């Protein structure tokens, strides 16, 4: 049976974007702020669309390897070694309108 | 009808966690790194569970208000005024 939930929210406050991580008890509906960090970059890039959770199989792992390979051309964090992609992996599909 | 895709990935590299935002064009299949940011905290808390996208209706807006009200007790960023929660909003279900 459900023990509770964790939520990850992108919340604007004072015109700035933050990531908030919240825990919630199923039985009491009592809530806890786990983390509040930012400002964070907005999700996505261009175009409207709907977000979905996808699995983290080989295709998603190779997207992570792509991202690290590209970042290593930039070098902002030094030379990085890809380890793995973790859940959740989110995908937005953008339809031409 | 499909223009392309965007991905938001949590990727460990050199044992540090980063958020990577990637675009993919449907017609060319080309991929672009939009943003790479971190180190970031891992999503969720301890314990496993399954993630889903939820809507940003009143329940979700009130979670955002909860968060801003709580953060305003500490004040690491000063005093904040809640504006809104945007998409995507993610929910992880934890089972007993
Ligand atoms: Mg959907």
Q: Following DSSP, what letter does each residue of A9-76 receive, concatenated?
A: EEEEETTEEEEEEEEEETTT--EEEEEEE---PPS-SSS-EEEEEE--SHHHHHHHHHHHHHHHHH-B
Architecture of domain B1-42: Roll (3.10)
Resolution (A): 1.6
**CATH 3.10.450.10 domain span(s) along chain A:** 1-42, 44-97
User: C-alpha angle B34/A85/B24, rounded to 5°?
Assistant: 35
| Collapsed DSSP state (helix, strand, coil) of residue B68 | helix
Encode burial over B41-59: b for 16+ CB neighbours within 10 A, e otherwise: bebbbeeebebebbebeee
How many angstroms does the Cα of residue A51 sit away from the middle of ligand 1? 6
**B48-96 has which CATH code?**
3.10.450.10
Residue of B1, B12, B66 with shortest CB distance to A22? B66
**Cα–Cα distance list, A29 to A20, A49, A76, B64, B84 (Å):** 17, 31, 42, 15, 21
Q: Which 8-state DSSP code applies to residue B61?
A: H
Residues 6+ apart with CB under 8 A from A14: B79, B80, B81, B83
Hunting for tokens 């993610």 — which residue is that? B90
Q: Note whether B95 contacts A63, CB cutoff 8 Å.
A: no
Residue of B37, B64, B76 with shortest CB distance to A41? B37
Q: Does A94 touch chain B (CB under 8 A)?
A: yes
Q: Please tell me the class of the A44-97 domain.
A: alpha beta
| Cβ neighbours of B31 (radius 10 Å) | 16
Q: Give CA–CA dist A87/A60, Å, rounded.
A: 10
Experiment type: X-ray
| Collapsed DSSP state (helix, strand, coil) of residue B40 | coil
How many angstroms does the Cα of residue A8 sit away from the middle of ligand 1? 17
| Collapsed DSSP state (helix, strand, coil) of residue B72 | helix
Q: Give CA–CA dist A8/B77, Å, rounded.
A: 19
Encode burial over B10-22: b for 16+ CB neighbours within 10 A, e otherwise: bbbbeeebbbbbb
What spatial distance separates the first Cα and last Cα of chain A, rounded to whole Å? 43
Residues 6+ apart with CB under 8 A from A78: B14
**CATH 3.10.450.10 domain span(s) along chain B:** 1-42, 48-96
Interface list for A 10-49 with B (CB within 8 A):
10-15, 17-23, 31, 33-38, 40-47, 49
């Amino acid at each position: 049976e459900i023990k509770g939930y964790e939520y990850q929210l992108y919340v604007y406050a004072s015109d700035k974007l933050f990531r908030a991580d919240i825990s919630e008890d199923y039985k009491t509906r009592g809530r806890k702020l786990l983390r509040f960090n930012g400002p964070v970059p907005p999700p996505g890039g261009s175009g409207g669309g709907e977000w979905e959770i996808i699995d983290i199989g080989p295709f998603t792992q190779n997207l992570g390897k792509f991202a690290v390979d590209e970042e290593n051309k930039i070098g902002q964090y030094g030379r990085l070694t890809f380890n793995k992609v973790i859940r959740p992996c989110m995908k937005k599909t953008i339809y031409e309108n």
